């Protein structure tokens, strides 16, 4: 929530930036995860919980509640030094900047997915733990790994498996 | 026991009684009965209707100040001292005016000495 001066001061460093995209099948919670991380981190991004955040810039997008257009946001923050020890990459200081790109999850928007992949260097992949790996996650993963993007996985909606499904720990 | 309404004729319109009317200008009125409603639509002033509360009020049917002299304190002085000061001895007052007279006399003496 700070001015553009420190934004530039962290922008000029090129080993703490992480341009990444979140990719998932439709109805998996990509918008929810993006808005929660906007709630926590953010260059100026706040923690408003009025349904959808800036990633739904279009009135029709909010009305129908289908993600359509991609909007890129930046998340600057800091983490402890004993956890900085985990980063075996090129590190510099305490501040870290992330360029998140929220791409639409429909098969018909795979062109926007490709365009986002060109910009990005890393990816977070989101999978509902109830549905498993659906068609679109497989397809976008193929696109990302053909575009040479390192993906990191995240299984969403664990509450669904533990309440709606009542899964025992072993089968979970 | 809702809000106790009042018609144009001033009577208390009880819940479940009367009728409410909303004009297009946004003004809402209440009429105790069809007699009241029809009179209002006829645009007859209630002040010329012998049995309305406005008429009785207008025709008077059925029908001081304090100049105080507080004396308080004043900032930078003493409350106990100011009353004594304003009620001081007349002997002290005449002594004060005569000492002012001799102060003026010696001021004249000093001014003459300086001007000489």
């Amino acid at each position: 929530n700070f001015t553009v001066d420190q934004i530039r001061a962290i922008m000029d460093k090129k080993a703490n930036i992480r341009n990444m995209s979140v990719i998932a099948h439709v109805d998996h919670g990509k918008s929810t995860l993006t808005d929660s991380l906007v709630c926590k981190a953010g260059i100026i991004a706040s923690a408003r919980a009025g349904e959808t955040r800036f990633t739904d810039t279009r009135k029709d997008e909010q009305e129908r509640c289908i993600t359509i257009k991609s909007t890129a946001i930046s998340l600057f923050y800091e983490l402890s030094e004993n956890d900085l020890n985990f980063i075996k990459q090129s590190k510099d200081g305490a501040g870290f900047l992330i360029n998140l790109i929220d791409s639409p999850g429909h098969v018909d928007f795979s062109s926007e997915v490709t365009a986002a992949l060109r910009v990005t260097d890393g990816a977070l992949v989101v999978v509902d733990c109830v549905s498993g790996v659906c068609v679109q996650t497989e397809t976008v993963l193929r696109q990302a790994i053909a575009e040479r993007i390192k993906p990191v996985l995240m299984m969403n909606k664990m509450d669904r498996a533990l309440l709606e499904l009542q899964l025992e720990p072993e089968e979970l | 026991m809702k809000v106790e309404l009042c018609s144009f004729s001033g009577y208390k319109i009880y819940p479940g009684h009367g009728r409410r009317y909303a004009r297009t200008d946004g003004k809402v009125f209440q009429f105790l009965n069809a007699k009241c409603e029809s009179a209002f639509l006829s645009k007859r002033n209630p002040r010329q209707i012998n049995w309305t509360v406005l008429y009785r009020r207008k025709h008077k049917k059925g029908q001081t100040r304090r100049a105080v002299k507080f004396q308080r304190a004043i900032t930078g002085a003493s409350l106990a001292d100011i009353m004594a000061k304003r009620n001081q001895k007349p002997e002290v007052r005449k002594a004060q005016r005569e000492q002012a007279i001799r102060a003026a006399k010696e001021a004249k003496k000093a001014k003459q000495a300086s001007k000489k």
Binding site: - | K2, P15, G16, H17, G18, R19, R20, Y21, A22, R23, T24, D25, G26, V28
Partner: protein
Amino acid sequence: SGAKFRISLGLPVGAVINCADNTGAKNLYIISVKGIKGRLNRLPAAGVGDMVMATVKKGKPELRKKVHPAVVIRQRKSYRRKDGVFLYFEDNAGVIVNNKGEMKGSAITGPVAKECADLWPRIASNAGSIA
């Protein structure tokens, strides 16, 4: 939610009501009432808060020879508000909407019945005041 209670109908098919919006229309000629099954010889009737189908008889020529959705917002027949109030308005009037209920116009002239305002949110948001 809570549905609207029954109200005295007052406005059957054939009635001409004012158009309170700013679409340039003048009046609505109610040709039907949405959601009325009916009965032999019983003319379909509509109160406030009901959606009707109407054609404007006066107004801008691009609106006249067409059928439009509409919602009655003021009626002249007195109706009970389930708490003793027998309320009626000075005139019969409605606004022109679409099927989803969004108001074609943007401002509403005069008051709007509470039943209509609660049934339709966007009508309420355009309403000058509620009576």
